[PDB]
Amino acid sequence: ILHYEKLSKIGLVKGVTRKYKIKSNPLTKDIVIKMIPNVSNMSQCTGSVMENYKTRLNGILTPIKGALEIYKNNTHDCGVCMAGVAIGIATAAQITAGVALYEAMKNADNINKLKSSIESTNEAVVKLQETAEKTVYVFTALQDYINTNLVPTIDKIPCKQTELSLDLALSKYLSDLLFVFGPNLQDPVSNSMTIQAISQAFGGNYETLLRTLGYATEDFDDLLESDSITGQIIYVDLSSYYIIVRVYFPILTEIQQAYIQELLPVSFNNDNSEWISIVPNFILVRNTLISNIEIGFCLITKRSVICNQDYATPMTNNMRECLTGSTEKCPRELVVSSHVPRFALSNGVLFANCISVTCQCQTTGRAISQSGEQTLLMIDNTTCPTAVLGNVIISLGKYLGSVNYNSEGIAIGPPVFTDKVDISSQISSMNQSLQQSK
Amino acid sequence: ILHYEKLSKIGLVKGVTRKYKIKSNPLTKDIVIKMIPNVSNMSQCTGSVMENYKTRLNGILTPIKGALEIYKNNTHDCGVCMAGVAIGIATAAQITAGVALYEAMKNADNINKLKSSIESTNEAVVKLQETAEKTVYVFTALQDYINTNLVPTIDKIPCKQTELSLDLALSKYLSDLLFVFGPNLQDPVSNSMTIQAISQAFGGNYETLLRTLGYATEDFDDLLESDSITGQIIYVDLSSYYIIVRVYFPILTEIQQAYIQELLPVSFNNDNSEWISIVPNFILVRNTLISNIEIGFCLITKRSVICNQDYATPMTNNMRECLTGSTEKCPRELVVSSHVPRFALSNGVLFANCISVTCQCQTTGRAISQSGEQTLLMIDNTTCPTAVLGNVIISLGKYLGSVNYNSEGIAIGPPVFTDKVDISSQISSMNQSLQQSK
Amino acid sequence: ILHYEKLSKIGLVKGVTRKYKIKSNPLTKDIVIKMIPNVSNMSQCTGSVMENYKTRLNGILTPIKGALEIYKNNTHDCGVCMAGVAIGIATAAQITAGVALYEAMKNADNINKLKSSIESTNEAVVKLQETAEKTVYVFTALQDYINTNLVPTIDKIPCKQTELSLDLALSKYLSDLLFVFGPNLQDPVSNSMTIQAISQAFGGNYETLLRTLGYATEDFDDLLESDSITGQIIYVDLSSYYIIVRVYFPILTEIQQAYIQELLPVSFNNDNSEWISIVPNFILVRNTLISNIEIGFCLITKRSVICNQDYATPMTNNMRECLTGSTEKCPRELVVSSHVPRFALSNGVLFANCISVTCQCQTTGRAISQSGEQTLLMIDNTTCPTAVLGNVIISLGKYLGSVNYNSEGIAIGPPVFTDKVDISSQISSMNQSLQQSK
Amino acid sequence: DIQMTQSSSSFSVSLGDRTTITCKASEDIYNRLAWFQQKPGNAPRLLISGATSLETGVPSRFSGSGSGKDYTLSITSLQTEDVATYYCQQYWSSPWTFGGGTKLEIK
Amino acid sequence: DIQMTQSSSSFSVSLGDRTTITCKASEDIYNRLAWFQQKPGNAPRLLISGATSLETGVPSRFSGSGSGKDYTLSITSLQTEDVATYYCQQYWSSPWTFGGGTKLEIK
Amino acid sequence: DIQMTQSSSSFSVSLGDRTTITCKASEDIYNRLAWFQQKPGNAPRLLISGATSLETGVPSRFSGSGSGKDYTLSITSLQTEDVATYYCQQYWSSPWTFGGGTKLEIK
Amino acid sequence: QVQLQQSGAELVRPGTSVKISCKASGYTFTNYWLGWVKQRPGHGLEWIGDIYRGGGYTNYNEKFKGKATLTADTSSSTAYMQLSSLTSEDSAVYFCATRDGYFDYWGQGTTLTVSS
Amino acid sequence: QVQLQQSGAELVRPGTSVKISCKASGYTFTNYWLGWVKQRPGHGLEWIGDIYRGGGYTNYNEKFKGKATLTADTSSSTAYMQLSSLTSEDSAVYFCATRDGYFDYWGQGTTLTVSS
Amino acid sequence: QVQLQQSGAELVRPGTSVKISCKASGYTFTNYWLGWVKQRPGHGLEWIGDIYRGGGYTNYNEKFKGKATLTADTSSSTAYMQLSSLTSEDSAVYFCATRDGYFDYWGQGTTLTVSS
């Protein structure tokens, strides 16, 4: 495993250990998002704003539909056969998404048998259930605003103002919509489109969608904020102006014999100067295999690191040896900033750079001094039952590692500069050194 | 051109070819955004929230007007002479934007001749047209909310509550406004400020602005989402609290003899391990010159890559030789992520890593096996009329390249690690190797 | 200091000098954000939507309260002592935030003595002041929408529509809330949480919060947009569904003997080709110590660079020598793009790449020609009183540097390629060159 | 609360034959099911996590399946070590409940 | 639809003299104009893309200009190969329309 | 406008003794205070920026403190060079206001 | 080099249907609009409709909607225009042309003559 | 190797309280849920409540809320279950078990007998 | 080293205008506020107004608004204060001072005496 004692001497104090869990086994529910409101109760002075809205929305939704029938007409049963000659160029994810699209087309047709019922909806959330075959939920984009603002104010204001309010609401809805469903949606076939983005067709109210679908569970927020709950547009209507979206609700399976170890970057002292270690702060260990993880794309939780995809990335042999004990292979960067963390706590044991912060023990009253040959000081109850770090007074546990932690020095790694301009500068200098040596 | 066969053996299956088109030749329309609503119909109980809003908005807009009159007083007719001594420090873009500002000042004065008419506007969208000289559209920030909600509820609620609602609406408008027009707008002279950002002075409703200006066209969404439709604030009024913005509506000219080639990163097999090739996935070729493109800032469309600026960046000679056939110079990274693409389709021909996925042929029932010396398998109708990749069954076309694709091996490039910490580790190792050799 | 003449010959024309100021000395005000509206006036037309909202909000807020009572029960007076054994693993920032939380608990209890008054609030902004001990402001999440829209429409629309609208408003509020207060808020103890994020508990209206608290100053917007005004949740109520937040309002302390120098990247000519210098555009000089600055996280203002903590980062010795005169150590990148800056103005003196732009002098009518051995031309009134570069005509001051600027050549640096794929390519090439030399 | 009902409190299956234990939830739990095996005098041991995912220490003869409310644990070849009580646990709702337990027996 | 009207169905311009062909749109097309040259028995060939941008194969004597509704194609020195019918196309609105066609002639 | 009131127009403090100058704002200025020392015939020189932060050239015997409306400048050991008029400036609200001036004297 | 090879001239009796083809070859870009333009003697160029080869949708002129039908084959990169219920006024030269707003590359033209 | 060592079987007079302990050892992950399950003869497994070791909050079954009290010691990784006002129906085997939705690792079980 | 050199003391008749100058030299930062402060005998410091050498706007005291006029010359880094309609109460020492909220660097002061 990782050599946590030498890493802590380097300033990489080990943090909490988190499970590795990834989205798997999606369950599918089909919803209808009617992208046009029903203005039947205020149609006497609606004007031409709704026809203009229909034209604009048709222009927006036509490319999405055409991208769908790229895969509708080129996919058929055989048990799902894909016409790759006609498609020409596609990726594995896009082809799998087209297969899922053609799988969803049967329920799309069952829903489209309720076309007139979808058109007649005059509430923001309507449940359509004629038989058990057709039990779909319909969400209308601006129906609530119509029913509660424009209809009640028909007789209160000159309803040309009601017409302008309707036009402005529709245009604001289109402004919020175009960031997601515009030309940014180059590939609507893909099912990686999250429910947050699809909810922009409902004004950004994914909470209503997912509460209506009955997805309330303890892992609901974890699946939501990790972008695991995604949807796929499976049908686009250019006449009634609605879309059928297949919502994928997965289960977070835990990767067995896998964990993410967090390291807390404590600055340490060397050569009368302060340093931090340039190592990954999160290390994914699966079956004792040490590797990097793109944890920026994952949701970090107290129990687990939650990901919608396997974000494991390779790690250099030098960095792996750094993590396993070879501290001489750990790059270090200077500390010019005055806001670097000087200390951290792990298992009740305090690892502090007492060169930079005035450590002193409350139990004894004498200052906890750090020598020039010590990178950090491990402060535990054997040497200081209660340490003070300025405004902080903290009681400390006993260190489970070596009792000679503060007397055992280590080898130190090479200094580095991680600025991208400094990266180009160092590449320039190494290339010129190679040319001089050659 | 690019050696697509060797690249596909490396796993860089060629995708769709897109045109290169850039924003050019902007046409100018001037609009007025009145940043304070007209509360005359509820003036009897607006309270002091309007005076507080005026004070806050004046404090917000005063730096913008100061930055404008930096260039108003230092620019004059010669035929547009600029006093560079008084300005002191400026960039080429800022100087050009100041020249455009001084060009727009004549229409700004023509509009400001309608100052009283702009003040008197009581609708969210008002067209002011006294003569042909003055045909400007005025958009009011919160007028629709006033006329629709607060005025009808004057007699329904104790209109101290109406005062509170007006104050909350104005403060929410300022909260949405300060992200764009606050101290973030250090240089309001520049005309690169997009119309989406300027629409935050209208509550984020750029759809109303651009539909009212009559910019409805097939390229409108492409120009909008590529950040090509931009505006420039040309006048700020600190008494009537409105701004005059010159909206620039360009044409997407095609870069002749230029195209962007997309490469699909199929993982390939070598040394009983999985690799991906570290090459740019989009290559811009202009006049047979191969170069990189910062496509993150551009809009990618099925027909073309659409840019508001020439985002072409240089490419190393080694990567250019990688793309032209020198596969030994193509860097490769290990695969630890189990979710990287295993296969892709191009022109009806399937390039798959059959070591990692169970390729099989539906026509014969035989599994398509990959040897240890093959990076990928080209699957076409000559060897497999219809291939199965699990849930995917796909019919395949005929490969137009070499018939001996699967028997012709290639040289492979050096392994790399692209993590920025691993980048620092490799720089450390190369520097120490240089020092040891020196 | 920096050798601005040689840098300008390299194309790094010096810009404006900005002060360095950092957030410091925060003053604390406690506010209450009630996350549930008062529906007393529409209780008969409410239904069970409030119970579902209470369940959802309790599920959201329970982890926050748990994370707080990690530090409530493990911190006690002594003068603030923590049981770090019970806490186990923490960082310096988290421990300092725990100290701040325990310091705030006394005012939290003083506020919680007004629990019934907080519950009884029926306005969006309510000031609770029984005595001088309890002078808190309560902000209600959706009270304005209730009092303005739903209560007046009880008798206008069927009350089922009112229930549906209340449910939709609450669900939209939760959708906006979950981006901030959901599982993304792993560490609610920290006081680095900005006031914009906390305002999402008030619908994103931080302007109302801060204007109500009385923070209107000239530096208010600078503190706001630099993320210096932050807040810390100090109490969570799971019965009345409100939180007590300690808002930290700091002062911008200028870092003495420190300034940030901006460099304008003018492209320059060499070897019949166009280049741009790869240097940091902003250089932080403190006590004559030249270092980098992560200015992406800082607010850039005409007077100063405003940061919420010290973003100074180390700089390579090669770049420090580049900036101090060693132009041979300055990396340069090819210019393939046609939109990079060709010229810039500094102190009324124009530095232009007249190979790429048609410089000509208005005073004499002669074109300002550049030789192949000149990287740039300095254009001042001694050689051209008024220069024209395309559409711009600019009057120029006198250069204060060497009069032989245009005749004194300089050493040039090594070419670089800054694309991250090309960075991996150059690392591959240098590693293989090292292996060949070894 | 979600009431979790198993088909039989006891089943008599011969050795080597396929054994099927079914469990019905009161409402849709969306594959948030666990299958546990508990021999007398011992704590329950996890067999299936989710509807189908096996625990790493479980033999492949244990197969999980199910949809909606109906779920099924299958033993392809019953052995003498599989004679135990099997419990279905839902973990979809906060009041976590177990099945009645199917005490497997040998004919 | 946008009706595109050219001034004359035919002009008689001597060789070497400047030739001006004008085209008026029914509404403002915002420089979304194209100019095409079509000799008899041949397909139209693009001359101007946009109001002013020349096709890469077009001689520099063809100059595009225009503003608002009014647009102009100019030939600075008329040659014998320029005797053809010239069409203006708008591409602002979906019902794409061409001009009436200006059959250029020699006096 | 924020009225800035100092306790006395003049104090008589012996050399070496601690000198206290207090300044009260009409409203809470949130530590946006400055302390200035002005000898006769000279421009004011900044002593304290903010409530507590000293200017780099100011001796450590000058100590700034304050809360709310009340602020205090303290000289721990009065010297002969500290005999000057001391001004408190607020920079919280737009009209910048100085105190009445405290002409320090020696007994 | 871009060539849009069209089918030869057709003499078709009135009342029946003709299906003009246009095989685009040498085009660099994968996805594009391909429009059809009608040219009668005594009349200017008349736009019929565009087939969009990338995504599965097409635009028709309202005059020609129903008269013409645009299909495409992405394998051989050829597009078809099915003209139904041909009359004497349908006798014209039909050009296929790739377009980017403006028509860029034109086919040689298929002369359709409808007579009995 | 994960072991959840529980306290031994207890014989408790009715009307008094017992405090069952569960010392988790060998668990890799710092923060987790730890649940208590009741098993009476003639009855299935009955979930009592969950203590969450990472954040300071706990879940109780509504049947057992007030009856049981869950506390945890983060130093020794030992959690406790205080059962108050014991009656004859409280005699059961009590298992501590770490859970991630599903109960993952179970303790050996503390047999509580309530009789006089 | 920062020096704000002001013009010399001026003896001005009542009813006419004086234009006091202040050339800031040695200031490191390009953009800054420059305030003017009035100091009468028997009175404290009175802020007149701020000129912004960065953005092109200025703040005035409501007492001095209209009375004083602040202009700046960015080429020579010299700012001016035009005082119009001088009276006997306008005789005071006027200081220019850069400020960042607090006045940082002060000029030596221009003594204006208005008498006849």
What single string gives the DSSP state of each residue in D47-101? EEETTTEEPTTS-TTEEEEEETTEEEEEESS--GGG-SEEEEEE-SSSS-BB---
Q: Which chain G residue shows the shortest CA-CA distance from A63?
A: G55
| Residue A387 host element (H or E) | strand A386-388
Angle at which helix B49-72 crosses helix C206-213, to 10 degrees, equals 100
Beta carbons of H100 and H33 less than 8 angstroms apart:
yes
Please answer whether residues C249 and C218 qualify as being in contact, where contact means their C-beta atoms are separated by less than 8 angstroms.
no
Helix, strand, or coil (residue C98): helix
- Which DSSP string corresponds to C218-234? TTHHHHHHTT-SEEEEE
For residues B172 and C207, the answer to whether their CB atoms sit within 8 Å is yes
Q: Does A149 touch chain B (CB under 8 A)?
A: yes
Tokens of F10: 């003049």
- Comparing alpha-carbon positions, the chain D residue that sits nearest to H6 is D43
DSSP assignment letter at B139: E
Angle CA G89–G95–G100, to nearest 5: 130
CB D37 within 8 A of CB D84: yes
- How many beta-carbon contacts under 8 Å exist across B and E? 25
CA-CA-CA-CA torsion sign (B158, B163, B166, B172): negative
Sequence-ordered list of residues with C-beta below 8 angstroms from that of C224, at least 6 positions apart, any chain: B178, B182, C195, C196, C206, C210
Pairing of strands H58-60, H110-114: unpaired
List the structure tokens of A437. Answer: 């040596």
Helices A49-72 & A159-181 angle (0-180, nearest 10): 20
Could you give the CA distance from residue C351 to residue A354 in angstroms, rounded to a whole number? Answer: 50
d(CA C215, CA F31): 12
Cα radius of gyration rounded to whole Å, chain A: 30
Residues C359, G84: Cα–Cα separation, whole Å = 63
Reported as type and span, the H/E element at residue C202 is: none
CA distance F99 to D96: 69
- Tokens representing residue I24 in the block: 């800031």
What is the token pair recorded at A339? 């806001």
SS3 C300: strand
Alpha-carbon gap, residue B84 to B88, rounded angstroms? 6
**Residue boundaries of the structural domains of chain H:** 3-114
Tokens encoding A139: 């969400």
The CA distance from A300 to C429, in Å, is 37
C-alpha F46/C-alpha I98 separation (Å) is 12
Residue among B70, F84, F42 at smallest CA distance from I58 = B70
Tokens of A426: 């160092």
Q: C207 with B175: CB under 8 angstroms? A: yes
Angle at G53 between CA G47 and CA G54, to 5 degrees: 130
Rounded to 10 deg, the angle between the C49-72 and C159-181 helix axes is 20
Q: How far is residue A211's CA from residue A249's CA, in Å, rounded to a whole number? A: 13
Whether chains F and G touch (3+ CB pairs under 8 A) is answered by no
Whole-number Å distance between alpha carbons of A187 and A175: 20
Chains H and I touch (3+ CB pairs under 8 A): no
Cα E26 to Cα B159, B436, E98, distances in angstroms:
51, 78, 12
CA nearest to A234, candidates A192, A264, A293, A191: A191
C223 close to C250: Cβ distance less than 8 angstroms: yes
Task: Name the CA dihedral angle for G56, G61, G65, G71, rounded to a multiple of 10 degrees.
Answer: -30
* Residue B325 one-letter amino acid: G
Per CB-CB distance under 8 Å, the chain A contacts of D50 are: 25, 251, 253
Q: Assign a CATH topology to domain H3-114.
A: Immunoglobulin-like (2.60.40)
Report whether H52 contacts C66 (CB < 8 A): yes
C238: region left, alpha or beta (phi > 0 left; psi from -120 to 50 alpha): alpha
Give Rg (Cα) of chain H.
13
Helix (H) or strand (E) segment spanning residue F22: strand F19-25
Bridge partners of D23, per DSSP, are D6, D71
Walk across the sheet containing B386-388 and list its strands: A75-77, A80-83, B393-395, B386-388, B360-361
**Radius of gyration over every alpha carbon of chain E, rounded to an integer in angstroms:** 13
CA distance A319 to A331: 9
Decide: residue B361, CB within 10 A, 0-12 exposed, 13-18 middle, 19+ buried. Answer: middle
Q: In what order do the strands lie in the sheet with E4-6?
A: E4-6, E19-25, E70-75, E62-67
Inter-residue contact C388 to C357 (CB < 8 Å) = no
Helix (H, G, I), strand (E, B) or coil at H112: strand
CB contact under 8 A, A164 and B124: yes
CA distance B35 to A431: 56
Strands C12-34, C304-307: pairing kind: parallel
D74 contacts D19 by C-beta, under 8 angstroms: yes
Would you call C327 exposed, middle or buried from its count of C-beta atoms within 10 A (0-12, 13-18, 19+)? buried
Q: What interhelical angle do B160-181 and B49-72 show, nearest 10?
A: 20
3-state helix, strand, coil in chain F (%, to 5): 5, 45, 50
Q: After which residues is chain H broken (C to N over 2.5 A)?
A: none
Strand I92-100 relative to strand I110-114: parallel, antiparallel, unpaired?
antiparallel
- β-strand C125-129 against C90-91: which pairing, if any? unpaired
The Cα F68–Cα F23 span in angstroms is 11
Residues of C in contact with B416 (CB under 8 A): 424, 427-428
B189: closest chain I residue by CA: I55
Question: Measured between alpha carbons, how far is B196 from B245 in angstroms, rounded to an integer?
Answer: 13
Distance CA A124, CA A277 (A): 54
Asked whether B86 and I74 are in contact (CB, 8 A), the reply is yes
**F68–C contact, CB cutoff 8 A:** no
Name which of D31, D56, D93 is nearest A251 (Cβ-Cβ).
D31
Of G109, G107, G82, G69, nearest in space to G16 by CA: G82
Smallest CA–CA distance from H4 into chain D, residue: D43
Q: Which two tokens stand for residue B393?
A: 């069954």
Crossing angle between the packed helical segments C317-324 and A420-437, to the nearest 10 degrees: 100
Burial of residue B184, with CB atoms counted within 10 A of its CB: 0-12 exposed, 13-18 middle, 19 or more buried? middle
Give the nearest partner residue to A69 out of G30, G56, G73, using CB atoms.
Answer: G56
Tokens of C378: 């300095």
The tally of CA atoms less than 13 A away on the side-chain side of residue E10 is: 7
Strand, coil or helix: A204: coil
Q: Which residues pair with B27 in a beta bridge?
A: B249
With beta carbons less than 8 A apart as the criterion, state whether C295 and C311 touch: yes
Alpha carbon G55 to its chain centroid, in Å, reads 18
Q: What is the DSSP letter of E17?
A: S
- Residue B217 C-alpha, separation from nearest chain E C-alpha, in angstroms: 6
From the CA atom positions of chain B, what is the Rg in Å? Answer: 30
Burial degree of C432 (CB within 10 A; 0-12, 13-18, 19+):
middle
Mark yes or no for CB contact B164/C430 under 8 Å.
no
Q: Which residues are I36's β-sheet partners?
A: I49, I96
Beta strands across the sheet bearing I68-73: I3-6, I18-25, I78-83, I68-73
Rounded CA gap, D1 and C418, in Å?
A: 60
A334 touches chain B (CB under 8 A): no
Interface test with B, best of I57, I59, I60 (most B CBs within 10 A): I57
Would you state the structure tokens that stand for residue B214, as one six-digit string? 């009559």
H or E, element range at C52: helix C49-72
Task: Report how far residue C387's alpha carbon sits from residue C377's, in angstroms, rounded to the nearest whole number.
Answer: 12
Upper half-sphere CA count for residue A432 (Cβ side, 13 Å): 15
Q: Which residue of G has its CA nearest to A187?
A: G55
Q: Nearest Cβ partner of F98 from I45, I104, I109? A: I45
Asked if H77 contacts H25 with a C-beta cutoff of 8 angstroms, the reply is yes
Neighbouring chains to B with at least 3 Cβ pairs closer than 8 Å: A, C, E, G, I
Chain B with chain G: Cβ pairs closer than 8 A: 32
Please give the span between the terminal C-alpha atoms of chain E, in angstroms, as a whole number.
36
Q: 3-state DSSP call for residue B126?
A: strand
- What are the structure tokens assigned to E65, written together? 């200009």
Torsional class of B287: left (φ above 0), alpha (ψ -120 to 50), beta (otherwise): left
Which among A123, A164, A119, A126 is positioned nearest to A147, based on CA atoms?
A123
CA distance B187 to E82: 50
Q: Count the residues in chain C.
A: 438
Q: Which among A296, B425, B416, B293 has a CA at the least distance from the CA of C423?
A: B416
Residues C387, C392, C395, C397, CA torsion sign: negative
Mutation site, G29, G57, G59, G76, interface A, largest A CB count within 10 A: G57
Q: Tell me the C-alpha to C-alpha distance, in Å, between residue C74 and each of A237, C101, C112.
A: 59, 12, 21
Q: How far apart are CA A373 and CA A198, in angstroms?
A: 58
Using CB atoms, pick whichever of B264, B336, B425 lies closest to residue A291. B336
Q: What are the tokens at C97?
A: 């935030």
Amino acid code (one letter) for B380: D
CB distance from F53 to chain C under 8 Å? yes
Cβ–Cβ contacts within 10 Å for residue I53, how many? 23
Dist. CA B342–CA B388, nearest whole Å? 13
Find the discontinuities in chain C where C to next N exceeds 2.5 angstroms and give the residue preceding each: 78
d(CA A376, CA A362): 19
Q: Which residue of H has its CA nearest to C70?
A: H56
Count contacts between A and C (CB, < 8 Å): 205
* Rounded alpha-carbon distances, angstroms, from residue A342 to A12, A251, A377, G73: 11, 40, 11, 67
Chain I contact set for B89 (CB, 8 A): 30
Domains annotated for chain E, with CATH where assigned, are 4-106 (2.60.40.10)
Judged by DSSP in three states, I46 sits in strand
